[PDB]
Amino acid sequence: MTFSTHKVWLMFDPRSTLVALAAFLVVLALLIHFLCLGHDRFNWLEGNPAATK
Amino acid sequence: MTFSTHKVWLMFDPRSTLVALAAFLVVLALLIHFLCLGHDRFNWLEGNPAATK
Amino acid sequence: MTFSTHKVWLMFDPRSTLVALAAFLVVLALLIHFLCLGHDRFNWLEGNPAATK
Amino acid sequence: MTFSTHKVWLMFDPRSTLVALAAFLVVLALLIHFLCLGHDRFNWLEGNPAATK
Amino acid sequence: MTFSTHKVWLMFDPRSTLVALAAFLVVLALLIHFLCLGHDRFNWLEGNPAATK
Amino acid sequence: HKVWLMFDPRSTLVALAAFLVVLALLIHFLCLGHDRFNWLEGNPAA
Amino acid sequence: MTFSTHKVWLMFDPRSTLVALAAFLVVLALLIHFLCLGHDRFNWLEGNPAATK
Amino acid sequence: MTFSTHKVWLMFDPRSTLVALAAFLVVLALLIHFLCLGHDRFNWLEGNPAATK
Amino acid sequence: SSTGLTEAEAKEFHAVYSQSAAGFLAVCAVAHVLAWMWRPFWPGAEGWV
Amino acid sequence: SSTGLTEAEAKEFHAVYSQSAAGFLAVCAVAHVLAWMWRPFWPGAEGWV
Amino acid sequence: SSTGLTEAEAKEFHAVYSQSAAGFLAVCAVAHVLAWMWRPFWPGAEGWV
Amino acid sequence: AMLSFERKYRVRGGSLIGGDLFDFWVGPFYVGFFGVTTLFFTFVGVALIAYGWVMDPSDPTVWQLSIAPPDLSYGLGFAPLMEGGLWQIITICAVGAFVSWALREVEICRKLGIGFHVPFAFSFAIAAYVALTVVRPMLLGAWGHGFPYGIMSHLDWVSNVGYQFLHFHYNPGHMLGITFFFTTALALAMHGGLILSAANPGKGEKVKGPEHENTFFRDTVGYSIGTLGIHRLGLILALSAVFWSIVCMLISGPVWTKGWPEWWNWWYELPIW
Amino acid sequence: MIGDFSSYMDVAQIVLYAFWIFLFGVIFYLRREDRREGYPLERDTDGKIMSIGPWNLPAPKIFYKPQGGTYSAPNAARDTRAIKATRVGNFPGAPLDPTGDPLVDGVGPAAYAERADTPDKTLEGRTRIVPLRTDADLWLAPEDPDPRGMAVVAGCRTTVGAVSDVWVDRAENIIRYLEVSLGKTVLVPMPMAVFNDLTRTVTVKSMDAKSFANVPTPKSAEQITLREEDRIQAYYAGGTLYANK
Amino acid sequence: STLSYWLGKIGDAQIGPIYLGATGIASLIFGFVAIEIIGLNMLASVDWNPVEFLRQFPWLALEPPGPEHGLRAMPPLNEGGWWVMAGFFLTASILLWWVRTWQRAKDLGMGTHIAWAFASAIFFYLVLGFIRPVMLGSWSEAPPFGIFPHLDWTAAFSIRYGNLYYNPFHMLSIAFLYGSALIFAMHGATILSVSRLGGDREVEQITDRGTAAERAALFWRWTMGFNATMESIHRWGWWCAVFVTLTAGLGILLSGTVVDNWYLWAVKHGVAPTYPDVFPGVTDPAA
Numbered sequence A, B, C, D, E, G, H: 001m002t003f004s005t006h007k008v009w010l011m012f013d014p015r016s017t018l019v020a021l022a023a024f025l026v027v028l029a030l031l032i033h034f035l036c037l038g039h040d041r042f043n044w045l046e047g048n049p050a051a052t053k
Numbered sequence F: 001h002k003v004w005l006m007f008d009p010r011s012t013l014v015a016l017a018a019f020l021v022v023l024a025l026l027i028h029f030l031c032l033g034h035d036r037f038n039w040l041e042g043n044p045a046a
Numbered sequence I, J, K: 001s002s003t004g005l006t007e008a009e010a011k012e013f014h015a016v017y018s019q020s021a022a023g024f025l026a027v028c029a030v031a032h033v034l035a036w037m038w039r040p041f042w043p044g045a046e047g048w049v
Numbered sequence L: 001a002m003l004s005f006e007r008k009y010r011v012r013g014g015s016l017i018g019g020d021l022f023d024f025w026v027g028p029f030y031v032g033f034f035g036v037t038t039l040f041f042t043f044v045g046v047a048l049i050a051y052g053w054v055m056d057p058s059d060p061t062v063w064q065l066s067i068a069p070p071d072l073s074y075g076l077g078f079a080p081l082m083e084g085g086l087w088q089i090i091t092i093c094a095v096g097a098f099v100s101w102a103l104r105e106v107e108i109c110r111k112l113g114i115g116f117h118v119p120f121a122f123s124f125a126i127a128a129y130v131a132l133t134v135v136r137p138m139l140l141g142a143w144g145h146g147f148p149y150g151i152m153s154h155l156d157w158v159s160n161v162g163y164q165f166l167h168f169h170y171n172p173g174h175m176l177g178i179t180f181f182f183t184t185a186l187a188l189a190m191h192g193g194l195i196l197s198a199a200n201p202g203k204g205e206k207v208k209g210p211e212h213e214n215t216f217f218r219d220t221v222g223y224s225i226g227t228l229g230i231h232r233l234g235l236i237l238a239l240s241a242v243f244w245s246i247v248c249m250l251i252s253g254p255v256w257t258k259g260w261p262e263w264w265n266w267w268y269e270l271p272i273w
Numbered sequence M: 001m002i003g004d005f006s007s008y009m010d011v012a013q014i015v016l017y018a019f020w021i022f023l024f025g026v027i028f029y030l031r032r033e034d035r036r037e038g039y040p041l042e043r044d045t046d047g048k049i050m051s052i053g054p055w056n057l058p059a060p061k062i063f064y065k066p067q068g069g070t071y072s073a074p075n076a077a078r079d080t081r082a083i084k085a086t087r088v089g090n091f092p093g094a095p096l097d098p099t100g101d102p103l104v105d106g107v108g109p110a111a112y113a114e115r116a117d118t119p120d121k122t123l124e125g126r127t128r129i130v131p132l133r134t135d136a137d138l139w140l141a142p143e144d145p146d147p148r149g150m151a152v153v154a155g156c157r158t159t160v161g162a163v164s165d166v167w168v169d170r171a172e173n174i175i176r177y178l179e180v181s182l183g184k185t186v187l188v189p190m191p192m193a194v195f196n197d198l199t200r201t202v203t204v205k206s207m208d209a210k211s212f213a214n215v216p217t218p219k220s221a222e223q224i225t226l227r228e229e230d231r232i233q234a235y236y237a238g239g240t241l242y243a244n245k
Numbered sequence N: 001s002t003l004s005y006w007l008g009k010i011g012d013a014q015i016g017p018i019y020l021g022a023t024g025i026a027s028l029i030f031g032f033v034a035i036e037i038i039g040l041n042m043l044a045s046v047d048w049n050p051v052e053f054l055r056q057f058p059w060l061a062l063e064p065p066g067p068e069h070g071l072r073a074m075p076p077l078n079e080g081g082w083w084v085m086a087g088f089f090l091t092a093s094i095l096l097w098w099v100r101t102w103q104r105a106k107d108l109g110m111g112t113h114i115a116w117a118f119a120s121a122i123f124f125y126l127v128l129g130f131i132r133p134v135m136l137g138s139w140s141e142a143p144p145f146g147i148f149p150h151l152d153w154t155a156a157f158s159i160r161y162g163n164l165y166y167n168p169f170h171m172l173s174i175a176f177l178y179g180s181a182l183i184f185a186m187h188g189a190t191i192l193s194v195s196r197l198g199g200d201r202e203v204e205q206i207t208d209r210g211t212a213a214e215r216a217a218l219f220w221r222w223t224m225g226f227n228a229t230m231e232s233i234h235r236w237g238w239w240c241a242v243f244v245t246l247t248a249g250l251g252i253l254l255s256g257t258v259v260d261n262w263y264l265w266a267v268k269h270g271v272a273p274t275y276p277d278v279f280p281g282v283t284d285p286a287a
């Protein structure tokens, strides 16, 4: 999919694509934030020193 | 979605979208408040010192 | 499946095929990232020394 | 099945056979990769010394 | 229900009311007799001294 | 009142009687469950 | 049933009689082989001394 | 069933009889191989000494 | 209306129900006063001492 | 045919799909080169020493 | 309307329910004043000291 | 259109997201958006279970495989992937897959024009799993309270949690759940036997109808539940069993912290005696 | 030792494997019984019957029906009625689109089975589902509200008519259908109706005013066949997908 | 033949009449003798006080003979003889009730499927009380006739034979009980969902398939890839319920007779999980 491939929406439903993409992006963002929270250096709410080893 | 994309609601039902968005926002707000409460520096009810090491 | 085999889409439905392919690729990427996260040398968020023995 | 046995596809559906073959091949590849990962000499991500005994 | 409210039975069936009242009174009497039997001072069959402390 | 032109007097009375009997039993059990108010065990008040 | 009573099969269905008889015979043979295996003197695979006491 | 009793197939369906006999033979072969594996002297993969005593 | 009672019947039933409830509450109030006289059930600042 | 597409439609769809897949694979190859430069992922005879 | 109750019967019912609810709230306010006179329930800075 | 009567039923509709992109079948299975999410979560979870299996140093068999939850010291936080994080991620994926399965069943029910009794009943099993792995752990303040994901190790978790109260048989909710589970098997046996007896009356007998079905139970126990009442009764029995299991596990630890036999002192020393 | 065959094998393991064989045989038998309806399978693209082994398809069993007749399962009968729905390209798994009115045609959730064209009977041979106006031995329990006379509201909040009678199952003493005279008479399946005794209304949210005007009707006004029952119930079930939308 | 409004809401309202017959009367006589024995032993165990009986009824029981009596055919009464009599009379009443159910099925022209489903439960009950004690030669291995006591027996049976969780037939019986609940919830929900299509009339759907049976089959085919028929799901449920008690009897037969420690049996067969040694230096002080 590119800036010029506008005819993708003649095949793929815009509604399903938008609702599936939004769900996937929210799930991915939550997963990555939790993975960052699960490690010593990147847990910003915990505030460990950056040099963790 | 922007200030000028008013024809979204010709594609998405305004009411089901509103209720789903309300549910999502409430759940997200609860999750973020609980994440703040689960960490020492941001639990405003426990009142730990801001500098937590 | 090569660059010149365009008639595969007369047999495989582009919509179903791409939904399955996107799902498989995303899940495979997640698995391979989790495998790197589960090992000492390749967990980039834990940041162990490269020489793990 | 050989190079000259083109008439398999008058007996086996090409599309369903391709889906079944793709599923079997990916499952077998994952099985063998996990079997390699579960052994100290062939876990390339753990990187044990080759001479494990 | 008092002496002058003879018209209760125009709204409450006398036979069902009598049966329910008899059952309730028997159960209540059994409950209070068991309550007396379950305490040292008012168990007349066990015959403990009244001064039980 | 016209309460009984909307709520059935019989059923309301039988439900209220059941509720009151259950409540009385529960409060009497609550009193018997404390040493100060167990009038049958007869513990000292203080 | 003897060598001369050939009119049993006018009473019992041959096909189902043989299926049931084969099932019974196989189950009994398995049971007796396992009964022999369950005893020290007759377990031919364990090979205990024939003198067992 | 002997070499000359060819009319048994007018009583037993050849397809189902072959399938059932194959299933029984495979199950019996697996059972006997596993009972051999379950004894020290006849487990050819463990390689215990023949004199198990 | 909703229940098959005439307004006069409902008024009579309400009169009797109110009388019975007032009697029940008066007996309960006297019972609670008697129970307080037996043993007070609201503790002071020191407790039951 | 079976999918309801015309060979002309299938050809254009395959052009777009082929370009997208080739770009995805090129990005994956670049990411793999970057990951190898970060930390090589095939051990020697002695491991990660 | 959606209930089928007449707009005047609903008015009578709301009048009676309003009186009942106001009496209930007055009794609750009296009970809360009495409970505060028994033991105040908002601690100071020192707590229950 | 696989079954001999399936073609006329395979139409568009039933989607919970309002779209035709995922409306299709792969073999007998119906694929939805929630079917895709179910497969996503399922393959992630199964692959992570396999990863935890091959990374186990003790070389366990399929029975001895165990992905254990984090330590209780990690609280409701995040554990290392090899120290409970894998269990946490598999729990999240399992919850997602089960909810997606229920929503896909809702989609299939909407397509077939039938009631949503099946997704609703499966929601009770999902609620039991959630109460075991998410809700009870948060009530107790640690994800380490969930059971390990292993065929045989979750039995050890059950055993030790039961013996943490010295006699789990004396839990009242446990008693109610066991009563309802055994009654569900009793009722299922009775119902299956009655329908099989009506449909297979024997030789020389015609297929019996509702009169015979009701007569058999009125002649045996003295009451007939009917043909619609038996299925409501069975659904209610199974749902009550799972609900009382949830109650008994939510009162063990969050509520009761002592031996379960001594809870019955409420009855042994009831104020009556 | 007591229950041992070797240093590894023992009696419990062998009994467990014997139960494994028995359980797998029982599952095989059960799966054979699962294939008494709808098999052999057919392809989604041309309707070609797929070959199933005689070890997976059981021999037909004969049901001697209570009122006469013999039903066999499997029966070699296949539903081949023309479905009034189309799809673009015969791709396996592609769902169909109704050409006209899916409710009248019986497409999808409105599809129905060609059952017996005779009314269902009881043990004594009298019609099982009959309107209450015909039978005097059957009445309605005074503890429950009487549906008759209640207004009928569709899913569009429109009063489409009133309940004129109730059709009762004489074999189970249960109301099966509601006879509704449209403000010309239709049968509403009771599971598809919600009753409100305070406002005296019956809500059928699966129908619109347009769909009520096309509900199939029985040939007789005191007699309904199993096929008519099946068609009416399928119509109201398909209304959940095709009416208010 | 009275009616019941409350029972008429969940199902039918008619309670009765009940046909007892000869085997029914015999079963009632035997069972009443058993119940009288059990209840009078319970009441005598609190020294006849009904206040104490009400207090302690869950804790009361009729207790089996001790191990010192073995399989003595009739031990002394107050040493397990009452238990042996109650077990005999209960077994006779249960067997006569099974014959009664078989006969009721036969006289109605119906199949004897409920009778043979009851036979599985009777087999489990017999293994629990009679058959296993005979093989082990001890009445003491049988459950008491009491509410909390048979739970104590359950726990002590699991403890005695090394964590009955490791009994493979206990695992199978638990799988079959969970599957009974699963299948019966599935079937109840499926039939209730197609009740708008006449799905509760299942036997009419068996001999004449309607859209209810077709949609019920297709829901499960589209959900999990396979389905049953309107009659086959009942065979599924029947077999699942039968296997519960069949595997229960099989796993109780094997406990103490061929397997004495189930956890060690699982250790031998590679079933018991091994956990990291958190307590490194703990050994048996009596070794």
Ligand code: BCL
Pocket: B001, B002, B003
């Ligand atoms: C808030 C007032 C308007 C609105 C005004 C604008 C304006 C102006 C812009 C956007 C842009 C975007 N909007 Mg908007 N947008 C609205 C409602 C939405 C909703 C929704 C369902 O409610 C969604 C999912 C979005 C999503 C988006 C993104 C897809 C897009 C760029 C992503 C981004 O910048 O950050 C990532 C987004 C998220 C993580 C979630 C989205 C959160 C909010 C609602 C997005 C608006 C943020 C915007 C940048 C701030 C400007 C609004 C000010 C309050 C005036 N908008 C409402 C109707 N939106 C930008 C764009 O089109 O890119 C070129 C842009 O310039």
Ligand code: BCL
Pocket: C001, C002, C003, J017, J018, J021, J022, J025, J026
């Ligand atoms: C990427 C751009 C083109 C493409 C361009 C080519 C070219 C050119 C060739 C192939 C060949 C093959 N392709 Mg290709 N291929 C495409 C998309 C696919 C898809 C799919 C559903 O996306 C699949 C399953 C495949 C599968 C395959 C293999 C079956 C086959 C030989 C196996 C192999 O060499 O590597 C093993 C397979 C894997 C590790 C997994 C397969 C997935 C990837 C996409 C394989 C393509 C890699 C290809 C060799 C690299 C060329 C692309 C460059 C980036 C420019 N292709 C797209 C349409 N493909 C070769 C062939 O026919 O053999 C003689 C060949 O010469």
Ligand code: BCL
Pocket: D001, D002, D003
């Ligand atoms: C690879 C390109 C050709 C092909 C070319 C050949 C040639 C040449 C030969 C075979 C032969 C066989 N092929 Mg072939 N075969 C193909 C695809 C298949 C597929 C499939 C579903 O994809 C299957 C199951 C098979 C199976 C088989 C075996 C049944 C058979 C002999 C078994 C064997 O040698 O090893 C056991 C098989 C397996 C363990 C699994 C099979 C997997 C692969 C695909 C088998 C390839 C074997 C063959 C030597 C490939 C080398 C070809 C070189 C490029 C020249 N082929 C494709 C179409 N195949 C041989 C034969 O028929 O004997 C007389 C033979 O000489």
Ligand code: BCL
Pocket: G001, G002, G003
């Ligand atoms: C073996 C080949 C013949 C056969 C030839 C004979 C002859 C000859 C005699 C019998 C006799 C008997 N047969 Mg015969 N019998 C056959 C098959 C059967 C089958 C069967 C379902 O297959 C059954 C249940 C029986 C049953 C019986 C017994 C009821 C009866 C003697 C009891 C006995 O010996 O105790 C043990 C039995 C069992 C534990 C069960 C049966 C096992 C076998 C099959 C019984 C055969 C025993 C027989 C003496 C062997 C004779 C064969 C020799 C080569 C001559 N037969 C076939 C058809 N059978 C005897 C008789 O009728 O007495 C007056 C007798 O003289």
Ligand code: BCL
Pocket: E001, E002, E003, I019, I020, I021, I022, I023, I024, I025, I027
């Ligand atoms: C002799 C028994 C007479 C009777 C004669 C009277 C008289 C006189 C009075 C009442 C009053 C009341 N009666 Mg009366 N009452 C009767 C039967 C009942 C029954 C019943 C279903 O049997 C009930 C529920 C009631 C209930 C009530 C109360 C609601 C009400 C005041 C509460 C109370 O005094 O103590 C609480 C109630 C209970 C704990 C349960 C009821 C117990 C008994 C049955 C109530 C009798 C109490 C009464 C003082 C007895 C005095 C009779 C003497 C001959 C004077 N009565 C019969 C018909 N009842 C009083 C009243 O209306 O006040 C304005 C009142 O003055």
Ligand code: BCL
Pocket: A001, A002, A003, J019, J020, J021, J022, J023, J024, J027
């Ligand atoms: C963001 C604005 C445009 C867009 C602009 C472009 C441009 C320009 C290009 C692509 C190209 C690609 N796009 Mg794009 N693309 C869009 C939305 C999508 C969506 C989607 C459903 O949201 C998907 C699956 C894709 C998929 C893809 C890939 C298959 C392909 C190359 C793979 C890759 O680089 O990373 C792997 C893919 C992923 C990890 C998932 C996709 C993630 C993002 C959205 C990929 C876009 C990267 C693009 C270079 C960023 C340009 C946006 C800038 C902010 C201006 N695009 C939208 C419509 N896209 C390239 C191509 O086909 O050439 C060979 C290319 O040059």
Ligand SMILES: CC[C@H]1c2cc3[nH]c4c(c3C)C(=O)[C@H](C(=O)OC)c4c3nc(cc4[nH]c(cc(n2)[C@@H]1C)c(C(C)=O)c4C)[C@@H](C)[C@@H]3CCC(=O)OC/C=C(\C)CCC[C@H](C)CCC[C@H](C)CCCC(C)C
Pocket: L038, L041, L042, L043, L044, L045, L046, L090, L093, L094, L097, L098, L101, L105, L118, L119, L121, L122, L124, L125, L148, L149, L150, L151, L154, L238, L239, L242, N178, N181, N182, N185, N186, N189, N223, N224
């Ligand atoms: C509430 C009443 C009963 C109930 C009901 C019920 N269950 C149901 C249904 C209903 C009505 C369905 O419709 C649905 C179904 O389709 O059944 C065929 C389902 C179902 N009941 C199932 C099983 C099941 N039900 C159980 C119990 C019960 N189900 C209750 C007793 C149990 C028990 C007691 O153990 C099990 C195992 C499935 C067959 C099915 C749901 C299938 C499903 O969710 O599929 C999507 C998920 C996957 C394909 C796999 C996901 C895997 C994860 C990503 C990783 C693994 C996580 C897991 C926690 C690991 C566990 C390890 C060890 C603990 C073993």
Ligand SMILES: COC(C)(C)C/C=C/C(C)=C/C=C/C(C)=C/C=C/C(C)=C/C=C\C=C(C)\C=C\C=C(C)\C=C\C=C(C)\C=C\CC(C)(C)OC
Pocket: N035, N036, N038, N039, N040, N043, N073, N074, N084, N087, N088, N091, N125, N126, N128, N129, N130, N142, N143, N144, N145, N146, N147, N150
């Ligand atoms: C005072 O009491 C009155 C009169 C009011 C009556 C009331 C009675 C009451 C309240 C009774 C209550 C009973 C209760 C609560 C019983 C609970 C029992 C439970 C829970 C039992 C659980 C399990 C028991 C089992 C499995 C027992 C099985 C026993 C068997 C199978 C024994 C078989 C014995 C045989 C066959 C003996 C044969 C005789 C021989 C052959 C030995 O003779 C030589």
Ligand SMILES: CCCCCCCCCCCCCCCCCC
Pocket: A037, A038, A039, A040, A043, A046, A048, B031, B034, B035, B037, B038, B039, L074, L075, L076, L077, L078
């Ligand atoms: C959804 C609510 C989540 C609440 C999380 C509370 C626990 C997180 C903080 C305590 C556990 C981590 C402590 C620090 C460990 C090392 C740094 C990751």
Ligand SMILES: CCCCCCCCCCCCCCCCCC
Pocket: L200, L201, L202, M021, M022, M025, M026, M029, N111, N112
């Ligand atoms: C190798 C083990 C094979 C086990 C096969 C088990 C088959 C069980 C079949 C049970 C049902 C039989 C038919 C009953 C029909 C109704 C009769 C009234």
Ligand SMILES: CCCCCCCCCCCCCCCCCC
Pocket: L027, L028, N224, N225, N226
């Ligand atoms: C022509 C297609 C016929 C159907 C093929 C697919 C069948 C899929 C069956 C899925 C369910 C299998 C469940 C097995 C559970 C075993 C215990 C884990």
Ligand SMILES: [Fe+3]
Pocket: L191, L195, L231, N187, N191, N202, N234
């Ligand atoms: Fe059923």
Ligand SMILES: [Mg+2]
Pocket: G038, G039, G040, M001, M002, M003, M004
């Ligand atoms: Mg031995």
